[PDB]
């Protein structure tokens, strides 16, 4: 049975747990899904192959710099997340998450994921970000960061609408396999 360990990282509130939840809920047959993910085993089928994806969430540990990395050994793929409603979350990709992940997970493939894409054209978030002299992340900034950090790929998604979620995990699975 092919098993791959997936760790999701990124700033607090950038949507890591909701992303795992939407994906996990999409499994068939339908199962009851918990609200915490550590070696959570999800079954996926990708290009005719059954894969056990063991999901680890760093939500709740984003400030535990010494404890969080204990989860990194044997990781096969990384979902590195920022939120499209938070340019600050994007800046932490090269400043915090990428040096960390490359240190503890050398040569482990990274999927760069822009969560909450439904917020890009959200009138309320535009207003809030404007108070800080910021605006939503544009797709091209996401793509350029992916190249900059050497990510396997860049994907945008919304856990709210579910758009792009499937494809995030398909890409992560292919990367873990390859
Ligand atoms: N609009 C929108 N909100 C989201 C999305 N994903 C998560 N959220 C909300 O953003 C907040 C943080 O999500 P969570 O998954 O707990 O982030 P975490 O801190 O990285 O685990 C919660 O209020 C979520 O309901 C999304 O795709 N779109
Ligand atoms: C399972 O999910 C429900 C929401 O769907 C939540 O109320 C419950 O606390 C969760 N149980 C566990 C063990 O995560």
Author numbering: 3 to 180
What does the paper say about this structure?
In the RhoA structure, we could clearly assign additional electron density at the hydroxyl group of tyrosine-34 to an attached N-acetylglucosamine moiety. Interestingly, despite the presence of magnesium in the crystallization conditions, the structure revealed an unusual GDP-bound but magnesium-free conformation. Tyrosine-34 is located within the effector loop region conserved in all Rho family GTPases. The defined electron density of the sugar attached to the hydroxyl group of tyrosine-34 revealed the α-anomeric configuration of the glycosidic bond. This finding implies that the glycosylation mechanism proceeds under retention of the stereochemistry of D-α-GlcNAc. We assume that steric constraints of the attached GlcNAc-residue results in the distorted conformation, which is incompatible with regulator and effector interaction.
Rho GTPases control cell shape, polarity and motility by regulation of the actin cytoskeleton. Afp18 mediates toxicity via a glycosyltransferase domain that disrupts RhoA GTPase-dependent actin organization. We find that non-reversible glycosylation at a highly conserved tyrosine residue is responsible for the loss of RhoA activity. Taken together, we found that Afp18 is a mono-O-glycosyltransferase, which selectively uses UDP-GlcNAc as sugar donor substrate to modify Rho GTPases site-specifically at a switch I tyrosine residue.
